[PDB]
RNA sequence: CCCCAUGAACGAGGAAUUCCCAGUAAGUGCGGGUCAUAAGCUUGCGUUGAUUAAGUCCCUGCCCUUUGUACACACCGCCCG
RNA sequence: UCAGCCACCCGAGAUUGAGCAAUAACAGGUCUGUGAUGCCCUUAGAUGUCCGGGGCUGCACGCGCGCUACACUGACUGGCUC
RNA sequence: GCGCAAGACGGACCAGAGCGAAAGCAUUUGCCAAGAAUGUUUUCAUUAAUCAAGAACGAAAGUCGGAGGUUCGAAGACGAUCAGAUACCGUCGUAGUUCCGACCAUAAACGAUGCCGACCGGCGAUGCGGCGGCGUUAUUCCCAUGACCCGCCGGGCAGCUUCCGGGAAACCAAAGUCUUUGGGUUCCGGGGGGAGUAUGGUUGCAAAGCUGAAACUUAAAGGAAUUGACGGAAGGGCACCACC
RNA sequence: AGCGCCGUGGCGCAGUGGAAGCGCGCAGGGCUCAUAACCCUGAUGUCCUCGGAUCGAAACCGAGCGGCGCUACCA
């Protein structure tokens, strides 16, 4: 379903935003 | 107050006004030093919860908690500090030192009698009736209890020491304590080649293998820490790694080669928890043998290692002069040995037994037991054979298979942690349910046929012996 | 098949369920089939001959109308992590 | 006031019971009823046939049709007529 | 049953009715400024249509400060159902729901139909202003005015109807005036995935927003309507291999 | 240190004397095309031991064993 994979995408993106920090 | 294990009815998050009132009451109770330390123990930016308990006796207790730490507790009435909060801030309450004989019983939740406090080791400063105090000892430097005075100190000393001086509200190792929480080529080539050759020699420092120097330069870690050695080879006299490999290879340290891909490959010249548990076997003396052990000091119920049973039987065969004269390997059986260690068909048949037979019979007549030391704790003694973790497969509902794991707690494994780990490993639904027999015993149910993964979990992860696990052949695969 | 003996379970049968609307259920005997000797089966035949219904979709099963459908090897379908 | 439905009379009869049964289909049962068959196997110590014996009938167990009864409107014994 | 307090919310009246650029907007009373339509033989005399850059407002949730906490209530905690429910049901209940002050700029923000203009069949209704018209009423006669009643005119929200014509069809008096193709203008799509992802840029306190690829992958994905078959949908209908 | 409560099916329990059952479990079956649940049938123990009362009992006296709890604990 759309709403949920949009959500999952935002989870993943937040996680990627954490794993790559401007300190790296 | 807490001497029994008590459950929790509920947890309430406190609004700002009630919070301020509560802190005003703590400041009134203690000195204003409380408030100075409150900002540490009760930060304004942190959540403040009250834990509502129902006692077995139907009493409503409340335990005030911020950040997981129990801080103060009350029944209908004035707030009292936990022994842990008081260990951190001992100056918030007056103190009373008690005689040693009371100590044991003081950690049994028993009230502190008057005579305990004027005998010469004890001491008694000045406090009014109703005031809250820390119970202390001579030979112990932390408060073992929290209690309230039923009599003023003067009245205590004066009366001839009869009746209850201090009601013991809280103590060490009661249930509240057990809860405990709620939910430059010189310098640079010297450093470099020192720590870098030492990180070219041992393991994981790689001994002798063809490998890239880069990987090794970026390998600064040993034993989960950096060498503090961080250096770039750009700090050396070698503007290239090829030159560094020209020098370091010249020293009878490394040998060099270039891969067809272009990396520089060197072949060196060779120049929080644990998983600890402890298990020991034991022998319990049955009634029938008591006579045989009378000389050793052991009665019915006494737990003995095999070595002690052998020493006691040998000592019994020497002291009663039962060792045969012409053969020192034989023991002539008196009425006591004949009664306890001989069968009914041998009752008058066998007059003598070798040491092997006598010792084996004496060991088999005793009740099997065992002792488990789970490190950090005192030994726990159990009766019977060591019970293996029991894995069973059941067909439930309509064609829905379940794996049930039992006797985890025997090994000191928490059913909930294991259920979680298994939930992540197997990737299905796990539950923790009550188990047949016993009392509170728990079993872990996984949805499926998972047994190989239990093989992975128990044999590999926790490194438990294969003899302690049961029912692994019914598994889909060996894993 | 026939004569004597032997003479046992069985005291109207639990959940469930089958068949049936008038010369009908049901009792009863008879003929044919199979058959050298054979019907506790079957297929027909008469004889004695009712209680209750002339109603309904509750159960079960299938029919038609409207409706929804991402199914059409058709819900034992398709399909998402 | 149309089909037809209900009561009664006149009557042997105001409901006799079966057979045959459409367009379609089922991947229903049928190599074991066919000198009806496409294949496969067997083909001379034959999966052929005839001869002589055994076996489909076996018995701690379930599930099925069916018979017989559990008695006084009955069983037995004679007698009378379909 | 009597009183008291607090915070929310304005039932019925309420409609295919009104008002607003859209979000949205219903207790009384006053104050403050707007606004469409209508009326006009008033005035200016082309001042106008649409809009990159750039600006104003922008539901809910969300975020910071403050106040406030009745109801409801994510999180959490139990109790059940269940093979399993960290779910539907139920008891408790944090953030939030409310007000004030700063952010956020996204919705199936939908009429899934850009805006201005011209033309093209009827028919009843309605809302608002105007015009005209017998007759009733506010008691009996005269004019006002209001309530119904019968029409006409101009805007509106809609409806029904039709071989106007469209259209793949559902349907549409606009989605009509389209191979007989040109009234003006802005935004914008190019098989399906990959992806509204990666990256850079930029806005934000944060969650995110705006701009936005490729490598690769794939013969379809899709829209209307048509017969089927199915439904734990709504209707009927039959049968002693259904029941009474 | 004691008092009570316990010592009855595999699992928990009833049983106010002629003297063993209730519920789950287990072997079967009925419902449905079939299984699971659902229903219906089979079955399931010196009643802690020792000694005693009692015409005769898990049911009543004591000696204990253990284990429960319960306490109130003057250590």
PDB file of N, CA and C in Angstrom, chain B residues 272-278 373-376 411-414 417 421 457-458 460-464:
ATOM      1  N   UNK B 272      28.863  -5.617  31.785  1.00  0.00           N
ATOM      2  CA  UNK B 272      28.077  -6.172  30.678  1.00  0.00           C
ATOM      3  C   UNK B 272      28.355  -7.696  30.559  1.00  0.00           C
ATOM      4  N   UNK B 273      27.542  -8.486  29.837  1.00  0.00           N
ATOM      5  CA  UNK B 273      27.687  -9.943  30.098  1.00  0.00           C
ATOM      6  C   UNK B 273      28.949 -10.738  29.722  1.00  0.00           C
ATOM      7  N   UNK B 274      28.841 -12.028  30.043  1.00  0.00           N
ATOM      8  CA  UNK B 274      29.767 -13.082  29.642  1.00  0.00           C
ATOM      9  C   UNK B 274      28.911 -14.336  29.356  1.00  0.00           C
ATOM     10  N   UNK B 275      29.543 -15.493  29.155  1.00  0.00           N
ATOM     11  CA  UNK B 275      28.816 -16.781  29.126  1.00  0.00           C
ATOM     12  C   UNK B 275      29.511 -17.855  30.007  1.00  0.00           C
ATOM     13  N   UNK B 276      29.654 -17.596  31.314  1.00  0.00           N
ATOM     14  CA  UNK B 276      30.466 -18.213  32.381  1.00  0.00           C
ATOM     15  C   UNK B 276      30.046 -19.517  33.089  1.00  0.00           C
ATOM     16  N   UNK B 277      28.777 -19.995  32.975  1.00  0.00           N
ATOM     17  CA  UNK B 277      28.203 -20.807  34.074  1.00  0.00           C
ATOM     18  C   UNK B 277      29.029 -21.984  34.652  1.00  0.00           C
ATOM     19  N   UNK B 278      28.825 -22.284  35.941  1.00  0.00           N
ATOM     20  CA  UNK B 278      29.556 -23.332  36.680  1.00  0.00           C
ATOM     21  C   UNK B 278      28.572 -24.387  37.218  1.00  0.00           C
ATOM     22  N   UNK B 373      26.551 -22.764  40.247  1.00  0.00           N
ATOM     23  CA  UNK B 373      27.071 -21.423  40.470  1.00  0.00           C
ATOM     24  C   UNK B 373      26.935 -20.608  39.184  1.00  0.00           C
ATOM     25  N   UNK B 374      26.039 -19.629  39.187  1.00  0.00           N
ATOM     26  CA  UNK B 374      25.916 -18.677  38.077  1.00  0.00           C
ATOM     27  C   UNK B 374      26.584 -17.387  38.544  1.00  0.00           C
ATOM     28  N   UNK B 375      27.763 -17.092  37.973  1.00  0.00           N
ATOM     29  CA  UNK B 375      28.730 -16.095  38.482  1.00  0.00           C
ATOM     30  C   UNK B 375      28.182 -14.705  38.844  1.00  0.00           C
ATOM     31  N   UNK B 376      28.677 -14.209  39.974  1.00  0.00           N
ATOM     32  CA  UNK B 376      28.117 -13.030  40.602  1.00  0.00           C
ATOM     33  C   UNK B 376      27.159 -13.412  41.723  1.00  0.00           C
ATOM     34  N   UNK B 411      19.075 -22.720  33.840  1.00  0.00           N
ATOM     35  CA  UNK B 411      20.407 -22.347  33.404  1.00  0.00           C
ATOM     36  C   UNK B 411      20.660 -20.845  33.624  1.00  0.00           C
ATOM     37  N   UNK B 412      19.646 -20.134  34.114  1.00  0.00           N
ATOM     38  CA  UNK B 412      19.776 -18.715  34.408  1.00  0.00           C
ATOM     39  C   UNK B 412      19.473 -17.832  33.209  1.00  0.00           C
ATOM     40  N   UNK B 413      18.857 -18.434  32.193  1.00  0.00           N
ATOM     41  CA  UNK B 413      18.432 -17.723  30.991  1.00  0.00           C
ATOM     42  C   UNK B 413      17.044 -17.092  31.218  1.00  0.00           C
ATOM     43  N   UNK B 414      16.906 -15.805  30.882  1.00  0.00           N
ATOM     44  CA  UNK B 414      15.624 -15.096  30.960  1.00  0.00           C
ATOM     45  C   UNK B 414      14.783 -15.433  29.732  1.00  0.00           C
ATOM     46  N   UNK B 417      14.161 -12.300  27.104  1.00  0.00           N
ATOM     47  CA  UNK B 417      15.316 -12.014  26.257  1.00  0.00           C
ATOM     48  C   UNK B 417      15.473 -13.048  25.142  1.00  0.00           C
ATOM     49  N   UNK B 421      15.338 -12.563  21.066  1.00  0.00           N
ATOM     50  CA  UNK B 421      16.424 -12.999  20.189  1.00  0.00           C
ATOM     51  C   UNK B 421      15.953 -14.005  19.144  1.00  0.00           C
ATOM     52  N   UNK B 457      21.297 -21.065  18.324  1.00  0.00           N
ATOM     53  CA  UNK B 457      21.234 -20.149  19.451  1.00  0.00           C
ATOM     54  C   UNK B 457      21.955 -20.721  20.659  1.00  0.00           C
ATOM     55  N   UNK B 458      21.622 -21.960  20.990  1.00  0.00           N
ATOM     56  CA  UNK B 458      22.138 -22.609  22.183  1.00  0.00           C
ATOM     57  C   UNK B 458      23.564 -23.158  22.029  1.00  0.00           C
ATOM     58  N   UNK B 460      25.893 -22.525  19.524  1.00  0.00           N
ATOM     59  CA  UNK B 460      26.867 -21.579  18.991  1.00  0.00           C
ATOM     60  C   UNK B 460      26.931 -20.290  19.822  1.00  0.00           C
ATOM     61  N   UNK B 461      25.818 -19.563  19.905  1.00  0.00           N
ATOM     62  CA  UNK B 461      25.783 -18.278  20.611  1.00  0.00           C
ATOM     63  C   UNK B 461      26.093 -18.363  22.113  1.00  0.00           C
ATOM     64  N   UNK B 462      25.391 -19.239  22.828  1.00  0.00           N
ATOM     65  CA  UNK B 462      25.559 -19.361  24.281  1.00  0.00           C
ATOM     66  C   UNK B 462      26.600 -20.408  24.683  1.00  0.00           C
ATOM     67  N   UNK B 463      27.084 -21.147  23.688  1.00  0.00           N
ATOM     68  CA  UNK B 463      28.117 -22.167  23.868  1.00  0.00           C
ATOM     69  C   UNK B 463      27.816 -23.154  24.990  1.00  0.00           C
ATOM     70  N   UNK B 464      26.591 -23.667  24.990  1.00  0.00           N
ATOM     71  CA  UNK B 464      26.174 -24.680  25.949  1.00  0.00           C
ATOM     72  C   UNK B 464      26.509 -26.081  25.423  1.00  0.00           C
TER      73      UNK B 464
END
